[PDB]
């Protein structure tokens, strides 16, 4: 607690965090989420295939 | 080659890899195996158990030639003769068995490690072990002693 | 073999010049004069070389014959092309492309021939 500030994000915070600063850990690399194919290739087996699915 | 050594890489480093605090002094700890019972006791006990003390009977004027008795195992017995000796005996119709004189090959005692191929052989040696004789007789061979 | 001979001379050769963070190779049939497996003019069963003509006009295209690899006296066939620049490049292009003779050196030989012919026309004051 002395080291963190936390709270309850709303929908708009989740959108802007994923859209502006969203990077994926793809093959241990920090890859910018520029295309939906990056999400669908690693998380498509869970039904998550787009930035909207990830945000949801 | 002196160009491949640490002394070339230690030029410019004041302590030459031996530290500033403890330095490189002449003989801290003694010379040779000094203090093997006092301040190097842990090293001597840890890596050289049995180092101190006497065990057994001393024998003056040991002549190693008297106890010279090289040994050969059964698994290498057939290497002392040529392969032709072996294959001729195997395809031999009669019961003739080749003679292997291990003394000629430079061994005195025949030990019994391993197994023999199933064909009789006459083995000449100074000494045999109990199991070596047992296995030679198992394949139909004979043990004959020489002096 | 070319690969085996390359592992012997890739760093130990009398034609090897290592200087100024650069590496050059000066054997006769090396287009681009670089120390490389592809451009080495000694280790291959078929090599292409382009040299200036002895009289100072035209180029000499030397190619390695297939049969006598161990016989260096007869291993190289040299021809002299002393026509205009465009037809000279066409002859070298047809030598390499049409014959399927070492087609990875086609532009290297064409560029070298252009450099040789340009060096033979008179200098500019």
């Amino acid at each position: 607690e002395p080291y963190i500030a936390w709270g309850y994000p709303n929908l708009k915070s989740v959108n802007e965090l994923i859209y502006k600063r969203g990077y994926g850990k793809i093959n241990k690399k920090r890859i910018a989420l520029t295309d939906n194919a990056l999400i669908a290739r690693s998380l498509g087996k869970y039904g998550i295939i787009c930035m909207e699915d990830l945000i949801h | 080659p002196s160009r491949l050594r640490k002394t070339r890489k230690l030029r410019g480093h004041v302590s030459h890899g031996h530290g500033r605090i403890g330095k490189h002094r002449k003989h801290p700890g003694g010379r040779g195996n000094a203090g093997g019972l006092h301040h190097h006791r842990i090293n001597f006990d840890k890596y050289h158990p049995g180092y101190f003390g006497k065990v057994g009977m001393k024998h003056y004027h040991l002549k190693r030639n008297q106890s010279f008795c090289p040994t050969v195992n059964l698994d290498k017995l057939w290497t002392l003769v040529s392969e032709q000796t072996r294959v001729n005996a195997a395809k031999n119709k009669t019961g003739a068995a080749p003679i292997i004189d291990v003394v000629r090959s430079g061994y005195y005692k025949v030990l019994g490690k391993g197994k023999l191929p199933k064909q009789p052989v006459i083995v000449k040696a100074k000494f045999f072990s109990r199991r070596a004789e047992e296995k030679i007789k198992s394949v139909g061979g004979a043990c004959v002693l020489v002096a | 073999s070319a690969h085996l001979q390359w592992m012997v001379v890739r760093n130990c050769s009398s034609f090897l010049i290592k200087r100024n963070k650069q590496t050059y190779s000066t054997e006769p049939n090396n287009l681009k004069a670089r120390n490389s497996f592809r451009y080495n003019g000694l280790i291959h069963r078929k090599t292409v070389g382009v040299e200036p003509a002895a009289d100072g006009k035209g180029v000499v295209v030397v190619i390695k014959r297939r049969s006598g690899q161990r016989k260096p006296a007869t291993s190289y066939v040299r021809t002299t092309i002393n026509k205009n620049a465009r037809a000279t490049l066409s002859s070298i292009r047809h030598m390499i492309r049409k014959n399927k003779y070492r087609p990875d050196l086609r532009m290297a030989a064409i560029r070298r021939a252009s450099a040789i012919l340009r060096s033979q026309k008179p200098v500019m004051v």
Binding site: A32, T34 | - | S1, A2, H3, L4
Partner: protein, 53 residues
Amino acid sequence: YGTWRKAASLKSNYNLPMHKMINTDLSRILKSPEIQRALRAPRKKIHRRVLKK
């Protein structure tokens, strides 16, 4: 120095050393149809860094 078929007749135990690679023609080996049949297709497209807009 002998052949690989027969040992040297003037050195009494010497025989020519063996090859650990019989065919050193690397380009011929790689281009052989049996090698080429087992290969996956080359990945010759360069994927440069994408500027995150």
